[PDB]
Amino acid sequence: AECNIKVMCRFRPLNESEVNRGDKYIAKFQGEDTVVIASKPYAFDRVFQSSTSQEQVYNDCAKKIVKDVLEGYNGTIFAYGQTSSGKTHTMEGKLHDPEGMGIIPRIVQDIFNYIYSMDENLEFHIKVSYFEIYLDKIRDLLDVSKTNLSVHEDKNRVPYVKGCTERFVCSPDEVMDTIDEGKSNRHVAVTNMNEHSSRSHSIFLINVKQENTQTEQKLSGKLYLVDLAGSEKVSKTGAEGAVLDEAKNINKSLSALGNVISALAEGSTYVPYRDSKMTRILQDSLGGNCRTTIVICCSPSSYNESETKSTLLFGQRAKTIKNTVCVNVE
Amino acid sequence: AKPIRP
Amino acid sequence: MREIVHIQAGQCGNQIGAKFWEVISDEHGIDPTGSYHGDSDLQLERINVYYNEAAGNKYVPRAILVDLEPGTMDSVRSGPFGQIFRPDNFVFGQSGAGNNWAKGHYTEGAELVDSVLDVVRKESESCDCLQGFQLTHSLGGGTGSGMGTLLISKIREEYPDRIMNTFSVVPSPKVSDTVVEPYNATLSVHQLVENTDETYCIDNEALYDICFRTLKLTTPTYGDLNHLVSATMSGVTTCLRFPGQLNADLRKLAVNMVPFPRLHFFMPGFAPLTSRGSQQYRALTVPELTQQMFDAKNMMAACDPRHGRYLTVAAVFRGRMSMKEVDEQMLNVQNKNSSYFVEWIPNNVKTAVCDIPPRGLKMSATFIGNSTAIQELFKRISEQFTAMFRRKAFLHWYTGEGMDEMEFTEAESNMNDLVSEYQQYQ
Amino acid sequence: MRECISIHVGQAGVQIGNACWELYCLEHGIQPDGQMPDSFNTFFSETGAGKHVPRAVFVDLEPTVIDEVRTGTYRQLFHPEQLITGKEDAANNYARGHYTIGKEIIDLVLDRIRKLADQCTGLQGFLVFHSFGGGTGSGFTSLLMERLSVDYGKKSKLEFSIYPAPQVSTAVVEPYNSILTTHTTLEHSDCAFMVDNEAIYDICRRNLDIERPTYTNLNRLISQIVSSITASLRFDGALNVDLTEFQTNLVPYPRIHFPLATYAPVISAEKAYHEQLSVAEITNACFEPANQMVKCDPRHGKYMACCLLYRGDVVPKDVNAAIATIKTKRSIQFVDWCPTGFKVGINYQPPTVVPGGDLAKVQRAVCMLSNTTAIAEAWARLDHKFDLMYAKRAFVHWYVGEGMEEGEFSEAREDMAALEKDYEEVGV
Ligand SMILES: CC(=O)O[C@H]1C(=O)[C@@]2(C)[C@H]([C@H](OC(=O)c3ccccc3)[C@]3(O)C[C@H](OC(=O)[C@H](O)[C@@H](NC(=O)c4ccccc4)c4ccccc4)C(C)=C1C3(C)C)[C@]1(OC(C)=O)CO[C@@H]1C[C@@H]2O
Ligand SMILES: Nc1nc2c(ncn2[C@@H]2O[C@H](COP(=O)(O)OP(=O)(O)OP(=O)(O)O)[C@@H](O)[C@H]2O)c(=O)[nH]1
Ligand SMILES: Nc1ncnc2c1ncn2[C@@H]1O[C@H](COP(=O)(O)OP(=O)(O)NP(=O)(O)O)[C@@H](O)[C@H]1O
Ligand SMILES: Nc1nc2c(ncn2[C@@H]2O[C@H](COP(=O)(O)OP(=O)(O)O)[C@@H](O)[C@H]2O)c(=O)[nH]1
Ligand SMILES: [Mg+2]
Ligand SMILES: [Mg+2]
């Protein structure tokens, strides 16, 4: 059957760098699923206000994806927004805090809990992959030797990264250790807007393969968790040197993603998936056999009104994309 | 190979 | 300043590069020994773009010639303009590829690509402001397609912010010189699409047509075809070497002529092109040059531009001419051929004028065209590839050197995606 | 003394500047070597004995044309530190001119300007020559204007741009560059005089009877116009006009500072005779829509302010008669809120004819700088081309790949739409 992309919007509290410089809250919320900026409606599935906690966003966004992955479908969650918007906070956040943990730790804990709650005749294999995109190069965040990798195609024409470290796991502790090791190798630079701005598009992959002993039925599952970098402007970021090169590549990749989203929204034919590595990897996520939810994080200050409008328009166009999701029966 | 079971 | 590293890979690339260097040296007044006996200072003004210096006013070109066989290198060396090259630059093995892309890209080419890269790196370090790279190869061969593709990938991953313009020779449609043309062509395109900035597609069929119809040559040879390719190779980068009223570098041409990253396959052209006994009757002027440039017979690729719509066109004029005349000619060409041009791009043509003509000519120009008609060549290559791949014909030679069928399917999918992209914008 | 700093950026800017400086040197009787065999301090500086150092900064990312200046006949005129060259061109990329490649010679040009400024006592303003559409003349000029606004600010800043023509065009990324630069430099420039190559081509075709105009003739015409603009400072006359006068008479509202220039009489040597070239005739011919230097009919709009700079043998009675005749005409439309939209300035120095030049020796000439609402349609067609290219998102990756957000295009489009709406509002 066909299912739509579930775009969800999150507005963070105003940060110190904006509250101390003549800024005003421009976002006005009505109902439970609409946001009004400069008297222009923008309707999404669920719009989270400033004070929304991590449990709320996880329960309203990603709890369905855990059950979908275990049942046999595929899932994808990725965050899009401006610099210092809340993508890293929404996805990962503080890794060990019971109240501040983001989407990834809650997803892994709930996937293990549902596995424990399943029937006794089933058997599961879980593998974890973690890589990033930097200067149009795919680097493995678990083994530094893999300086760059290649995106190939499968028999049924679904792209995938070749050579990424597939580490098997048994308990959530190993998953958390893998996440920590991947995060420590991720690239972080200090810009004016954000002190810990991420300069790479991190991707988290877990395959939950399912086998049944009695009925010999084998089911697959591919869950993608992506933390994109934000669009940056030299006037606000003040980048000079390596940071400027990172900003150039980040802007190019995000423009490619916007192009593919617009192409899917307009019902075109070419749907340019091949213009960037990120658009290649998430091809099945956007236009194939995946139930993907986009979590757009947007700054509510008057200083980022144009960027916030661009992000909301990107989310709005993505809501009309239709995906064809079918159970992966091997 | 490290399977998990309920 | 704004130097170009030149690479010749394979027999086709080497025999085109030899004529290219003879042509350039004649333009800059360099005799075969490496000395200078020119007539104007503008030759030596920008001699750094295509040459270096040495003691005693001797100029050695920054040409890097590579092949898996030494026969063509020996032919280049023993030729009339062979001693100008640096003897250390010739990098050659002894076992040829034998028209096997796998042999030239995985096993035999790998043992030479390291020293090739070392020569390239030394040349680039000796350069002041590296502008880009120039490569000549034939997609239908073994050493050319494979080794050039591997070297292009390595140089791209080493110098990601520099132009890589390659003058490749695509297989002819009607006549196939080698039985493995489809495989090699598809496997070469699968990486040319990703690792190049602007590639100029030439097929020998169009060159033979130009020679037979326009130049009226009774017995065209490979020398004449290589001469016509060298002409457009020199005309593309004329702004880098001489002053002009309006200057356009390779990156400027790329920005103008590449709307989307994967559509950078261009059809070259040149003008004027007349036969002896007909120059005394023609009229050398801008309208004649524009008419000859935009004609279908003058294109150096076997793709009729009428079966498609132009995306972007560059016209790198040369000599003394009025800018208003050029602009009016281009505008009326766009107006009279509105059907053959795209509407969501206004002012599809680009103009550059360099105030130095080639020797013996009052005016000259070069035509670079990004036409959706180039999908026909890729479509026929894909059709032949499918025909030869359904039945696994001529496949064990490639599979025996370490390739896989999945690589062939990936190459076919990439080619089909490029064809679909070109079809979309029509 | 009243002195101005002249800045030329990009190939068009430096060609125009070469023409302008040849005209200036001929005007003041200065040999190209810098040895004269007052009224020259405005554009030239004096050394201990002989050598005159023009107050010019020739800047370009392409070294080719500045090298032509360095090796040309005017080799020993400029202080070689003034002529600045980089390594690579901007490749018709606003991003390269502004963010990536521009921020490597911007410090040097700023230092050169500051050093020149410290040597001028009565600085009046800057004369920036650049071309919209080009990578350098749309990116580097924006950065330079931002720096000049931040540093000096109170000093005047005049621009002489080469606006893209409606039909005749050279680049394909020209609308993007033009809208980006007109969005960035709307808040900094104080009076930007715009011309387009198509109009000057037509003027040459119809008036000078030259069927093949080139860049040299266009640059000579622009040099004559700028000489008329700045001749009030150099020489004496009745009712001299300064740069602050230009700004405060030609700019009604702060966001409307894009006048269009016109020059007359542009005649050949053959037509120098058989024509009286009276003051009234020259003014009438200058108001004609065919003689405008921007491809826009003034009849489709209303004049806001128009300043006239007469040169040569001109008597105020003739000027008053001509202005009255112009006002009585019905085709010309002057806005309601400007009862007097005419400023005049008379100088006693006739225009000079460069040897080997198309123009002929004429007793009198005028330069009509008008601010009409007919310039809205040029912005309209430029915005239409930009929208057509941006709907399909063509060439965007080249700009995005050198440090420019995708939202900056939308911001520039919004600013241009605001400028169009403001022009429409002030019209009614
Ligand atoms: C008396 C006279 O004017 O003779 C001309 C001539 O008759 C014509 C027909 C020439 C002639 O060219 C050919 O016949 C030809 C042969 C093989 C391949 C291509 C062309 C000419 O041979 C070619 C030659 O070209 C040059 O000198 C250019 O500099 C040219 N040089 C070479 O290609 C070259 C040839 C041998 C050795 C070294 C260089 C060039 C063009 C572009 C960039 C660099 C160099 C010219 C003007 C002539 C002759 C001699 C008859 C033409 O070609 C060129 C390239 O100019 C053919 O159509 C043009 C028009 C010319 O008028
Ligand atoms: N009047 C006049 N216009 C010119 C001249 N040269 C170029 N132009 C116009 O300028 C535009 C091209 O921009 P250029 O100034 O050449 O480019 P640039 O500013 O040097 O920037 P880059 O070369 O890309 O670094 C086109 O619209 C040309 O018609 C000239 O000599 N005179
Ligand atoms: N919901 C939130 N509540 C409180 N603080 C938040 C919230 N979202 C983000 N922040 C703060 O903003 C800073 C983080 O920006 P982050 O949310 O990490 O930006 P980012 O989206 O990862 N920036 P970038 O990597 O450039 O796209 C942190 O120190 C957070 O504490
Ligand atoms: N113009 C020209 N084409 C050539 C030459 N030699 C080979 N070709 C063409 O190149 C293709 C063969 O590839 P080739 O370069 O010989 O194989 P390689 O040595 O393995 O790269 C065929 O289409 C030939 O017609 C030459 O000297 N000049
Ligand atoms: Mg981050
Ligand atoms: Mg230039």
Side-chain angles (χ1 to χ4, degrees):
Chain A
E2 55 180 10
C3 72
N4 307 79
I5 282 186
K6 316 280 284 303
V7 175
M8 308 178 187
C9 184
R10 187 172 200 251
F11 278 108
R12 59 150 218 277
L14 302 175
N15 49 9
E16 288 187 355
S17 182
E18 266 160 339
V19 71
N20 61 358
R21 175 210 50 183
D23 282 321
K24 42 186 56 57
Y25 210 141
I26 60 175
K28 201 175 307 303
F29 304 149
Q30 61 171 342
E32 207 181 0
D33 55 351
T34 48
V35 47
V36 177
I37 298 180
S39 71
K40 213 71 169 62
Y42 297 112
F44 295 128
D45 290 8
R46 275 225 60 180
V47 176
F48 297 142
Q49 312 188 29
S50 169
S51 57
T52 307
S53 295
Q54 305 281 14
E55 298 180 357
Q56 201 98 305
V57 46
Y58 171 75
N59 294 333
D60 286 356
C61 175
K63 176 172 282 295
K64 199 69 177 61
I65 220 73
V66 165
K67 186 176 122 58
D68 291 329
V69 164
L70 289 197
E71 192 172 346
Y73 303 96
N74 298 342
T76 289
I77 301 177
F78 63 96
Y80 176 91
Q82 197 202 5
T83 314
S84 71
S85 64
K87 315 172 217 55
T88 307
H89 193 67
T90 305
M91 292 306 299
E92 31 191 354
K94 297 182 182 180
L95 270 297
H96 303 348
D97 190 70
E99 199 178 7
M101 62 217 313
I103 298 298
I104 290 183
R106 299 200 186 278
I107 274 178
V108 304
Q109 288 183 6
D110 270 325
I111 210 164
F112 279 116
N113 286 129
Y114 264 87
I115 282 298
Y116 294 157
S117 182
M118 274 286 188
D119 274 14
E120 192 72 20
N121 42 18
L122 297 171
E123 299 181 7
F124 297 90
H125 301 64
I126 301 191
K127 38 201 298 301
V128 165
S129 300
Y130 206 58
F131 49 92
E132 71 174 13
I133 311 298
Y134 191 177
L135 289 185
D136 211 325
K137 291 184 177 60
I138 318 185
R139 316 208 331 170
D140 180 26
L141 293 179
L142 306 180
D143 186 13
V144 302
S145 63
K146 320 284 195 303
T147 181
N148 76 319
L149 305 177
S150 303
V151 169
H152 286 190
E153 266 140 16
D154 274 345
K155 302 166 295 301
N156 41 36
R157 214 186 306 263
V158 50
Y160 77 119
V161 281
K162 162 170 290 183
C164 62
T165 301
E166 306 167 352
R167 278 230 277 260
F168 293 80
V169 302
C170 314
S171 301
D173 193 12
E174 299 184 15
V175 182
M176 294 282 96
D177 283 355
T178 296
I179 275 289
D180 189 10
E181 187 176 11
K183 205 179 80 66
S184 182
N185 281 10
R186 197 179 177 184
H187 277 95
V188 288
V190 178
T191 57
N192 288 272
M193 298 205 64
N194 183 15
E195 41 268 3
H196 302 96
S197 173
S198 50
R199 324 301 299 178
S200 299
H201 304 347
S202 62
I203 291 189
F204 185 70
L205 212 169
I206 52 171
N207 299 121
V208 188
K209 313 201 72 59
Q210 167 169 324
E211 182 171 349
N212 199 326
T213 295
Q214 273 284 336
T215 185
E216 212 56 40
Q217 193 175 5
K218 193 186 306 301
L219 299 173
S220 177
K222 205 157 193 174
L223 186 50
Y224 268 113
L225 304 177
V226 189
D227 172 29
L228 289 92
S231 60
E232 316 188 353
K233 205 183 308 301
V234 184
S235 63
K236 301 174 183 175
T237 54
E240 290 174 353
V243 284
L244 191 51
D245 308 357
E246 298 171 333
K248 289 152 56 182
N249 263 86
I250 285 170
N251 291 9
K252 197 170 176 61
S253 299
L254 288 180
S255 180
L257 182 66
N259 285 21
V260 84
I261 286 295
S262 178
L264 275 173
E266 291 182 1
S268 179
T269 299
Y270 178 51
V271 57
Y273 291 117
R274 288 186 127 81
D275 47 0
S276 60
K277 305 288 198 307
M278 180 54 55
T279 320
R280 278 282 284 172
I281 299 179
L282 298 183
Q283 169 180 344
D284 198 73
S285 298
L286 285 181
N289 184 17
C290 287
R291 328 163 69 101
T292 178
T293 75
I294 305 179
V295 177
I296 42 176
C297 302
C298 311
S299 182
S301 175
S302 62
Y303 188 61
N304 308 271
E305 190 184 13
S306 181
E307 294 84 2
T308 307
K309 291 171 82 68
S310 299
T311 316
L312 263 76
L313 281 180
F314 176 82
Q316 197 179 30
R317 275 188 282 102
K319 194 181 74 66
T320 63
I321 312 182
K322 288 186 174 183
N323 281 144
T324 58
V325 186
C326 59
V327 188
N328 298 25
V329 178
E330 176 180 352
Chain B
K2 310 171 188 176
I4 56 176
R5 294 179 185 171
Chain C
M1 212 171 307
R2 291 172 308 177
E3 306 94 14
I4 296 182
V5 170
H6 186 238
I7 302 173
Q8 314 173 20
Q11 184 181 14
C12 195
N14 279 288
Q15 273 175 64
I16 291 181
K19 219 58 178 62
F20 166 83
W21 280 111
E22 184 174 358
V23 159
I24 290 299
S25 301
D26 194 11
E27 183 166 329
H28 283 201
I30 293 183
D31 75 330
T33 202
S35 175
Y36 167 80
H37 291 73
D39 215 338
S40 180
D41 314 334
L42 300 178
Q43 308 176 348
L44 300 179
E45 186 71 22
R46 243 74 189 188
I47 207 173
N48 171 261
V49 179
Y50 267 141
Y51 294 87
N52 281 339
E53 280 202 8
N57 306 325
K58 178 181 180 180
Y59 298 88
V60 302
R62 45 167 54 91
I64 297 153
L65 317 93
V66 306
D67 188 26
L68 299 183
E69 307 181 15
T72 176
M73 292 304 170
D74 206 332
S75 71
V76 167
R77 228 197 299 258
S78 299
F81 264 82
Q83 67 173 4
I84 195 181
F85 302 90
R86 177 176 296 177
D88 299 335
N89 283 7
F90 306 103
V91 183
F92 55 86
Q94 270 78 18
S95 60
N99 309 17
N100 197 330
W101 191 88
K103 177 122 62 178
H105 195 277
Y106 277 23
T107 303
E108 265 60 31
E111 285 194 346
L112 219 62
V113 72
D114 274 352
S115 50
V116 173
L117 273 172
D118 182 61
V119 177
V120 170
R121 212 184 316 271
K122 199 172 213 307
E123 292 276 20
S124 298
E125 186 70 22
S126 183
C127 288
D128 192 12
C129 179
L130 201 62
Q131 167 59 242
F133 298 83
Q134 206 170 9
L135 172 57
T136 312
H137 55 282
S138 185
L139 311 185
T143 75
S145 58
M147 201 149 56
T149 279
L150 182 63
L151 186 57
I152 279 174
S153 298
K154 253 62 179 303
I155 292 183
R156 190 73 174 183
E157 71 96 20
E158 205 77 16
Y159 301 76
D161 59 328
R162 262 70 186 90
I163 283 295
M164 181 102 79
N165 53 280
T166 76
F167 295 85
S168 59
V169 176
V170 293
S172 172
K174 64 178 185 62
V175 173
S176 60
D177 207 339
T178 78
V179 295
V180 285
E181 271 178 355
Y183 289 87
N184 300 342
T186 305
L187 296 165
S188 185
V189 172
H190 176 67
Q191 313 214 15
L192 281 188
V193 169
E194 309 283 347
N195 305 55
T196 53
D197 284 327
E198 46 171 26
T199 175
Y200 299 69
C201 294
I202 302 103
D203 43 62
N204 287 121
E205 192 270 341
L207 303 177
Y208 286 125
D209 185 13
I210 290 179
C211 291
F212 181 76
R213 271 202 262 257
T214 41
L215 289 178
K216 294 203 91 43
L217 298 177
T218 55
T219 64
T221 60
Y222 276 0
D224 299 355
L225 315 186
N226 295 357
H227 184 167
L228 296 164
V229 177
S230 306
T232 192
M233 286 174 66
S234 177
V236 158
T237 178
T238 175
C239 293
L240 278 185
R241 296 171 288 148
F242 297 92
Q245 291 175 338
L246 189 52
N247 312 127
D249 204 334
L250 294 184
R251 187 168 293 106
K252 188 161 169 175
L253 254 53
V255 168
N256 285 260
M257 278 201 59
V258 182
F260 299 83
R262 291 171 61 87
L263 313 182
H264 57 243
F265 290 78
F266 302 147
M267 307 193 314
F270 187 77
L273 286 178
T274 51
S275 61
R276 298 185 303 177
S278 179
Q279 262 304 130
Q280 315 91 17
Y281 306 115
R282 203 58 94 70
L284 255 183
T285 181
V286 176
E288 161 61 39
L289 227 54
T290 318
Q291 184 117 350
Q292 203 161 358
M293 284 167 57
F294 281 80
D295 188 12
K297 309 172 185 176
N298 202 16
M299 300 300 160
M300 285 191 287
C303 298
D304 197 6
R306 309 187 242 267
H307 302 82
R309 312 167 84 94
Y310 279 117
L311 251 58
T312 315
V313 154
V316 190
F317 283 81
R318 288 185 60 194
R320 287 184 177 177
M321 47 191 58
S322 183
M323 297 295 303
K324 155 72 176 50
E325 184 158 303
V326 172
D327 256 348
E328 189 187 35
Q329 289 303 134
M330 289 308 162
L331 187 61
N332 69 50
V333 160
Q334 287 199 223
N335 286 331
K336 296 191 77 172
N337 288 17
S338 62
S339 65
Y340 302 153
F341 278 98
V342 167
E343 57 188 10
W344 50 267
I345 282 186
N347 190 78
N348 323 74
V349 310
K350 195 208 177 307
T351 288
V353 164
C354 186
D355 207 334
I356 283 285
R359 301 187 60 87
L361 295 176
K362 304 189 67 176
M363 293 168 42
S364 179
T366 38
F367 187 91
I368 309 178
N370 192 348
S371 175
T372 57
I374 213 65
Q375 80 176 16
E376 291 283 329
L377 178 76
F378 296 152
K379 189 183 301 299
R380 73 168 63 98
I381 278 181
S382 178
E383 199 272 339
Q384 290 172 354
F385 181 85
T386 49
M388 296 193 69
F389 193 78
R390 283 210 324 272
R391 294 275 290 270
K392 261 73 155 50
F394 297 87
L395 197 65
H396 67 270
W397 289 101
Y398 293 81
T399 314
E401 257 79 351
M403 273 210 299
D404 284 69
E405 311 171 350
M406 281 311 299
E407 190 171 0
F408 289 100
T409 53
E410 287 172 16
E412 193 267 347
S413 61
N414 225 34
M415 194 81 269
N416 272 342
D417 284 7
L418 184 57
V419 168
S420 289
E421 180 173 1
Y422 263 118
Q423 232 280 345
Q424 177 215 17
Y425 290 130
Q426 186 180 203
Chain D
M1 312 306 298
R2 315 134 307 274
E3 304 175 357
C4 298
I5 296 180
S6 301
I7 308 172
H8 321 267
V9 180
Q11 194 164 17
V14 297
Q15 297 272 325
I16 283 154
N18 288 332
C20 293
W21 281 109
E22 176 179 22
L23 191 64
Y24 292 152
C25 290
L26 273 173
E27 275 276 2
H28 294 182
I30 301 179
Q31 297 183 355
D33 47 65
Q35 294 286 335
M36 183 178 183
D38 203 315
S39 298
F40 62 89
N41 215 340
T42 303
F43 285 118
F44 296 81
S45 183
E46 185 75 31
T47 202
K51 180 189 66 175
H52 283 65
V53 182
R55 297 180 175 88
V57 189
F58 286 53
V59 184
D60 184 12
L61 281 299
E62 298 185 351
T64 48
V65 58
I66 308 290
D67 282 332
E68 304 168 21
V69 178
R70 284 200 191 109
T71 324
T73 57
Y74 295 98
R75 158 177 62 255
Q76 35 198 0
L77 181 63
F78 303 95
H79 173 22
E81 192 62 32
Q82 303 166 334
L83 321 175
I84 300 180
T85 66
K87 319 288 284 190
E88 301 185 20
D89 51 348
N92 283 3
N93 208 326
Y94 170 84
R96 293 184 63 83
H98 194 183
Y99 305 92
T100 301
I101 314 298
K103 296 180 179 180
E104 294 176 348
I105 68 174
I106 188 68
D107 295 1
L108 257 179
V109 61
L110 264 283
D111 276 324
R112 290 315 307 179
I113 292 168
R114 190 181 57 87
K115 198 170 304 177
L116 269 180
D118 287 358
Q119 264 282 355
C120 64
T121 74
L123 186 57
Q124 294 222 341
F126 297 93
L127 293 171
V128 173
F129 299 83
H130 71 287
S131 49
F132 285 166
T136 299
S138 300
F140 190 80
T141 181
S142 172
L143 192 58
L144 184 60
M145 289 301 290
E146 288 186 0
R147 293 312 186 93
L148 286 184
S149 178
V150 169
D151 192 9
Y152 304 141
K154 296 183 179 181
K155 206 75 62 179
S156 174
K157 275 164 286 301
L158 309 181
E159 285 187 340
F160 287 75
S161 309
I162 305 295
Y163 193 63
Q167 293 241 292
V168 157
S169 176
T170 296
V172 198
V173 293
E174 198 168 16
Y176 285 3
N177 296 325
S178 51
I179 276 176
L180 286 175
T181 183
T182 191
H183 146 66
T184 50
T185 71
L186 173 55
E187 311 266 355
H188 300 340
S189 180
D190 294 0
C191 199
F193 314 96
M194 307 216 306
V195 289
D196 47 0
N197 295 321
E198 188 177 0
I200 318 183
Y201 286 154
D202 291 5
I203 287 180
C204 292
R205 177 188 64 88
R206 277 187 313 279
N207 292 11
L208 297 164
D209 290 333
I210 37 160
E211 294 285 343
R212 332 288 186 86
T214 166
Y215 280 170
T216 296
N217 306 121
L218 269 56
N219 298 326
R220 291 190 202 274
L221 272 281
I222 299 180
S223 68
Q224 298 288 348
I225 281 197
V226 73
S227 179
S228 61
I229 279 184
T230 59
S232 171
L233 285 180
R234 292 176 293 169
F235 306 92
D236 57 326
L239 312 173
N240 286 326
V241 176
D242 302 358
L243 304 190
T244 59
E245 311 198 8
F246 284 147
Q247 289 175 176
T248 204
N249 288 123
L250 264 188
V251 177
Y253 289 154
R255 229 168 184 262
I256 310 300
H257 53 54
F258 293 102
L260 70 167
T262 307
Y263 189 73
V266 195
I267 70 181
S268 176
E270 162 192 341
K271 281 191 289 296
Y273 326 124
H274 318 92
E275 310 296 330
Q276 271 273 326
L277 258 48
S278 61
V279 173
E281 185 172 2
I282 290 182
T283 313
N284 296 333
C286 202
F287 254 88
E288 183 184 359
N291 262 263
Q292 297 301 320
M293 281 217 168
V294 181
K295 256 297 182 299
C296 55
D297 43 348
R299 301 177 298 182
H300 282 164
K302 305 182 179 303
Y303 283 72
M304 296 195 227
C306 161
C307 66
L308 300 192
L309 297 108
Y310 284 82
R311 297 186 54 191
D313 198 318
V314 176
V315 200
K317 40 172 87 74
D318 306 358
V319 170
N320 266 6
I323 264 67
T325 52
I326 288 297
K327 196 87 71 61
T328 52
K329 196 171 304 304
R330 295 175 62 189
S331 64
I332 64 108
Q333 272 281 339
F334 267 92
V335 83
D336 51 66
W337 51 260
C338 196
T340 60
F342 281 145
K343 184 192 185 69
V344 296
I346 320 294
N347 198 278
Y348 295 141
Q349 194 67 22
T352 184
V353 174
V354 183
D358 41 358
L359 278 78
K361 191 173 186 300
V362 289
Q363 259 68 58
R364 52 199 69 88
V366 66
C367 198
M368 185 265 294
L369 272 36
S370 54
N371 193 335
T372 189
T373 50
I375 213 166
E377 69 181 25
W379 299 122
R381 57 172 50 95
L382 199 58
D383 296 4
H384 182 59
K385 298 171 66 177
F386 172 89
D387 291 329
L388 269 179
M389 262 170 62
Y390 187 58
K392 298 307 175 299
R393 210 133 293 190
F395 305 104
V396 181
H397 70 279
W398 283 102
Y399 289 81
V400 173
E402 279 141 348
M404 172 144 48
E405 197 189 30
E406 193 176 9
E408 265 179 295
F409 284 81
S410 60
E411 291 191 16
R413 185 50 171 82
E414 188 181 22
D415 257 318
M416 197 75 243
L419 194 45
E420 282 268 17
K421 191 183 299 181
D422 279 324
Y423 253 101
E424 185 177 6
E425 287 175 24
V426 73
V428 179

